Each structure stands twice: as structure tokens, then as C-alpha cells.
Curated annotation (Swiss-Prot), chains A, B:
Role, per record: Catalyzes the attachment of threonine to tRNA(Thr) in a two-step reaction: L-threonine is first activated by ATP to form Thr-AMP and then transferred to the acceptor end of tRNA(Thr). Edits incorrectly charged L-seryl-tRNA(Thr) via its editing domain. Deacylates correctly charged glycyl-tRNA(Gly), but neither glycyl-tRNA(Gly)(2'-dA76) (the terminal 2'-OH of tRNA(Thr) adenine 76 has been replaced by hydrogen) nor the 2'-fluoro tRNA derivative do so, strongly suggesting the editing function is tRNA catalyzed.
Region of interest (Editing domain), ranges: 1-141
Compartment(s): Cytoplasm
Organism: Pyrococcus abyssi (strain GE5 / Orsay)
Protein name per its UniProtKB record: Threonine--tRNA ligase
Highest rank taxon of the organism: Archaea
Entry text on domains: The N-terminal domain (about residues 1-143) is an archaea-specific tRNA-editing domain that has a highly similar structure to Dtd (D-aminoacyl-tRNA deacylase); the domain binds L-serine and L-cysteine and most D-amino acids but not L-threonine. Editing of incorrectly charged L-seryl-tRNA(Thr) by this domain is tRNA catalyzed.
UniProt similarity note: Belongs to the class-II aminoacyl-tRNA synthetase family.
Length: 141, 141
């Protein structure tokens, strides 16, 4: 798993076309979402993660939590992101892990948001620019 | 070299604190910059690139150009980005390659902008959300 963490003033997205034939279904109100003062977690689930969904999820939960605690973000957003890796996991594994990370961050106490899987999405973000505002982490079994 | 390419409605940045003791010097007017309808090129220069600055630069020039031509972006922005790699090049090599890529994109005919090296930078971006709007490429000797 590869993750890019961005401490942001705001992050807003709008779902555009489907990238998969059968993407994640969504209500009208899940097409757009916005959070402020938010640690955005751009997550690229890999093939190698298929071997241990739960361990990988637990590490990602913890690595993301630490940074959010260190930067004093109460809000966290989980986004799927095909763009930190070339060996990517099949969608079942990807959605599995993305939901596990989403749930475990809720369990830690953050106000957590997410984006639907399997779509092209427009987004806008304002990146803060302090020293810990942009971090990347690599997570394996 | 690792590159993330983002086709954007706009990209605006503001230089904040120095990340290096001796960063790239800049006039007042280089502290902020904005472009619209722009292919932003987030570039992470690696250790392995120290071996062939010019080849690596030529490939990056071409890979970026193709995408800009394919997405019909006349504007290209080159940003240094420490966040696509763990084995990063020393700053001399990094600035060397970043300037070569900047110059060669000017030679191709794009209106090209860049950001200063060696600073923490705040930025905002609106990502387009069509299928080719977010691409990553890996470039080696």
C-alpha cells in the first residue's frame, strides 16, 4: 500500500464518469462532499496487499492516525487513488481495505469522510504548506 | 524519476518557509504564481537519476509533452515534489534536472511555469476529473 497524506484547508470533490463498469453505487448526496481542516488520505492499494488485508489496514489506520494527531486534524478523508503504484489490487481487495481503513479511523474518533470507489472524480484542494503538510508512507506485510 | 501529472483548471501556489538552509533565491514576484488550464508536473527526482541527468530529463520532457498534447494543455507547470520516492537525489542534481525539464518544455512551445526549489509551499489546485486527468509515470536510465 502507498499513501500520500495531505493536510488541507479544504478538500471538495465531485463524482464524474464511471471508471469501472460496475462502480460503487451512490445516492445523489454522495456525488459531492466537502471537508475543511482535513487530513486527506490518498490511498493506492496494491497487489501485495491482497495477502493480508487486515494487517495492511491496521498499519494504514495507525500511520494515518499518528499524522492526524501530530498535525491536529480532527477530520480525515479517505480517497482511493490509482496513482502511487503500478502493481494495483483487484477492486474487491481495494474496497475491502479502503472500508477497513475508513471504519478503523472512525473507531479512533475522527470525523471521517470518503469518496466512492470506481469513478473518475474532479476535486479541489488547498494544501497548507507547513513542514508536515505532505507526507508519503509505504505500508507492507 | 517519478512524476505525477495533473490536468488542472487552475494551480496557484504561495512560497512559505524555507525547507533548506540555502534555498533557491527568488524575487518578491516569484513568491506567488498562478496558471489556468494547466498540466501540472509534480516531479520527484531520485538518486538513480544522478547517473544520467540529461537522458532522464529528455525522457521527462517527452513524457510530459505527450500528455499535454493529448490533453490539449498549452500551459505546463513544473513543481519539485519530495513525495513520490524514498531514494531522493541531492539538491544540485535535483535542480539541474528540474531546470533541464523546464527549458526543454519551453523549447517544445508550451507556456511553462515553475516553482522555486527548497521551500515549503502552500498550494491550491482544481483537478479536472476526466479519464486522463491524473497520470503517473516512472522514468529511469
Amino acid at each position: 500500500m502507498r499513501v500520500l497524506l495531505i493536510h488541507a484547508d479544504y478538500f471538495e470533490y465531485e463524482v464524474k464518469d464511471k471508471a469501472l463498469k460496475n462502480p460503487e453505487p451512490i445516492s445523489e448526496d454522495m456525488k459531492r462532499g466537502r471537508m475543511e481542516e482535513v487530513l486527506v488520505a490518498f490511498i493506492s492499494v496494491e497487489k501485495v496487499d491482497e495477502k493480508n488485508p487486515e494487517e495492511v489496514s491496521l498499519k494504514a489506520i495507525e500511520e494515518i492516525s499518528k499524522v492526524a494527531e501530530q498535525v491536529k486534524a480532527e477530520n480525515v478523508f479517505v480517497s482511493p487513488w490509482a496513482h502511487l503504484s503500478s502493481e494495483l489490487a483487484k477492486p474487491s481487495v481495494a474496497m475491502d481495505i479502503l472500508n477497513r481503513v475508513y471504519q478503523g479511523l472512525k473507531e479512533r474518533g475522527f470525523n471521517v469522510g470518503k469518496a466512492p470507489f470506481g469513478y473518475y472524480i474532479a476535486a479541489k484542494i488547498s494544501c497548507k504548506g507547513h513542514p508536515l503538510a505532505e507526507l508519503s508512507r509505504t505500508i507492507v506485510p
